[PDB]
A paper describes a structure:
Without external reductant, FADox➔FADH• photoreduction of CraCRY stalls in the semiquinoid FADH• state. In CraCRY’s FADH• state, helix α22 (H475-K494) and two regions nearby, N314-D324 in the α13/α14 loop as well as A404-Q410 in the α18/α19 loop, are disordered because of lacking electron density. Consequently, the ET pathway along W399-W376-W322-Y373 to the FAD chromophore is broken. First, the Y373 side chain, which packs closely against W322 in FADox and FADH− states, is released from any interactions by becoming completely solvent exposed. Secondly, W322 is indispensable like Y373 for photoreduction but belongs now to the disordered α13/α14 loop. Moreover, the FADox➔FADH• transition causes loss of the prominent salt bridges between α22 and the PHR domain, namely D321-R485/R492, D323-R485 and D371-H475. The order-disorder transition upon FADH• state formation is unusual as a surface area of 870 Å2 from 14 α22 residues is occluded from solvent access by interacting with the PHR domain. CraCRY’s FADH• state structure provides numerous additional interaction sites for downstream signaling partners like the circadian clock factor ROC15 (33). Our in crystallo observation of a partly unfolded FADH• state prompts us to note that refolding to an FADox-like conformation, concomitant with restoration of the ET pathway from Y373 to the chromophore, is required for further FADH•➔FADH− photoreduction. In contrast, continuous illumination used to obtain the static FADH• state structure drives the reaction completely toward the signaling state.
Author numbering: 3 to 45, 50 to 313, 325 to 403, 411 to 474
Write the structure that this text describes.
């Protein structure tokens, strides 16, 4: 006789542009905001990324409490928890954002069956991508386009992505009182210590929808920078103020709506007729993401499109002996984010013909440490790898940073090396090494390859 609904967060960790949340609140006597956390994640995942998620859930908790509700972090597996709470809470509707990843399809199909057995309606809107990816494939005749230029042609044919959804109401229907499965002590957001991590996170990027919107506003503080953006011309050695938006972790977890980002770019583009165009523009960057999601989700053998241990270990542990390479690998572990062309440098130095190895092994290392780790974006970018015309990937940074400021920041052992040798410290006169307190082979390794 009443509507009791669940809004289930997996991605889409936001209140803004959340059509699943708007549906669950409509005409609802009680709404249960749920995140399902697998407590036994022990089995691979850096504390930096997991803490980013926890911070994002803490932000959601604060947002829901401001509106008379709270987030319920349920422990267990969705297939076991949901049948119990469907009956306990008298649920009539279950809402959640659509997800096209492989595991998500298996998980969501099972939950859809359990909902039907309990008489629960399921509503799953598209809001993680700009477009309904299935719709794009259908309008392309039933096959995903295979080049960026062709893909940009198709979306231009389709038109603008949908507008961001309205903000939710200032007050929300709360969960019912004294429901055993909603008890606060069993449903709070845990800390990185409580989930089992021993080392603290070191990244400088904080999770959550609130920080995402703050960072988006900062990127749009200069419309001329947004209008003139060209990805290949940005500086990979810029760390104090990165040369790109660093919105990737926020888009990965859904703290930031891709649709809101796109709408804001078109606002700026209307007033700047000479703005950059795809693929180098900031809109092009969003379209790279959409392109790889579309191809990845509709391609069965997606990982097969691109056709010894010691070299990988040195690369993994930032001891290759090339300061530019080791500095980036240090940024990976410490920040979990590096500029696109820094990612290119270490990836080419690993796969494009310096250490050979297999690109899959390099992806595994990225998958552990990147805070923007994305099943589709990580793999696709490794394969699309297969710029250094003058500067080889091992001294690439010298073009932008002849003094080696980036290297000195992340490899402080080299902080007193004269700039003439900071990219090739093995060339320094051996008394220069002594003076700088950095002897090659003692304080910093010699190059691992001739
Ligand atoms: C080896 C390797 C591995 C990865 C990636 C590249 C390479 C070469 N990338 C892509 C890229 O390096 C990354 O998206 C940016 O460095 C993120 O920086 P900004 O958010 O400042 O991007 P910037 O502000 O330039 O772009 C804005 C947004 O567009 C998207 N975007 C930009 N460049 C992209 C690209 N090349 N491919 C797809 N989407 C792109 C992202 O959503 C990004 O947040 C990736 N990206 C990611 O989100 N998760 C990942 O796990 C990886 N892994």
């Amino acid at each position: 006789g009443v509507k009791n609904s669940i809004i289930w967060f997996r991605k889409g960790l936001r209140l803004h542009d959340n059509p699943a949340l708007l549906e669950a609140c409509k005409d609802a006597k009680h709404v249960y905001p749920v995140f399902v956390l697998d407590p036994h994640f022990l089995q691979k995942v850096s504390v930096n990324r997991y803490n980013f998620l926890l911070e994002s859930l803490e932000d959601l908790q604060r947002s829901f409490q401001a509106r008379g509700s709270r987030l319920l972090v349920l422990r267990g597996k969705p297939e076991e928890v949901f049948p119990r709470v469907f009956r306990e809470w008298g649920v009539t509707q279950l809402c959640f954002e659509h997800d096209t990843e492989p595991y998500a399809k298996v998980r969501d199909a099972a939950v859809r069956r359990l909902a039907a057995e309990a008489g629960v309606e399921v509503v799953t809107p598209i809001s993680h991508t700009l477009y309904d990816t299935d719709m794009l494939v259908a309008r392309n005749g039933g096959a995903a386009p295979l080049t960026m230029q062709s893909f940009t042609k198709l979306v231009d044919r389709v038109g603008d992505p949908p507008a961001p959804a309205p903000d939710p109401p200032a007050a929300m229907p709360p969960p019912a009182e004294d429901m055993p499965s909603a008890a606060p002590a069993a449903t709070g957001v845990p800390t990185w210590q409580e989930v089992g991590f021993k080392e603290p996170p070191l990244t400088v990027f904080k999770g959550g929808e609130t920080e995402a919107l703050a960072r988006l506003e900062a990127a749009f503080q200069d419309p001329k920078w947004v209008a003139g953006f060209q990805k290949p011309d940005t500086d990979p050695s810029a760390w104090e103020k990165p040369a790109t938006t660093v919105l990737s972790p926020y888009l990965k977890f859904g703290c930031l709506s891709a649709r809101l980002f796109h709408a804001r770019l078109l606002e700026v583009y209307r007033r700047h007729p000479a703005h950059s165009q795809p693929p180098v523009s900031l809109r092009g960057q969003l379209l790279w993401r959409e392109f790889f999601y579309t191809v990845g989700s509709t391609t069965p053998n997606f990982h097969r499109m691109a056709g010894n241990p010691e070299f990988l270990a040195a690369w993994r542990e930032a001891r290759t002996g090339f300061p530019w390479i080791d500095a980036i690998m240090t940024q990976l572990v410490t920040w979990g984010w590096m500029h696109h062309l820094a990612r290119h440098s270490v990836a080419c130095f690993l796969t494009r013909g310096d250490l050979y190895v297999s690109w899959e092994r390099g992806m595994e290392v990225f998958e552990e440490h990147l805070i923007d780790q994305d099943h589709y974006l990580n793999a696709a970018n490794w394969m699309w790898l297969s710029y250094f015309r003058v500067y080889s990937p091992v001294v690439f940074g010298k073009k932008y940073d002849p003094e080696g400021r980036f290297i000195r920041k992340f490899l402080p052992v080299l902080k007193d090396m004269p700039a003439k040798y900071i990219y090739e410290p093995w060339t320094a006169p051996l008394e220069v090494q002594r003076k700088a307190g950095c002897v090659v082979g003692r304080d910093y390794p010699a190059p691992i390859v001739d």
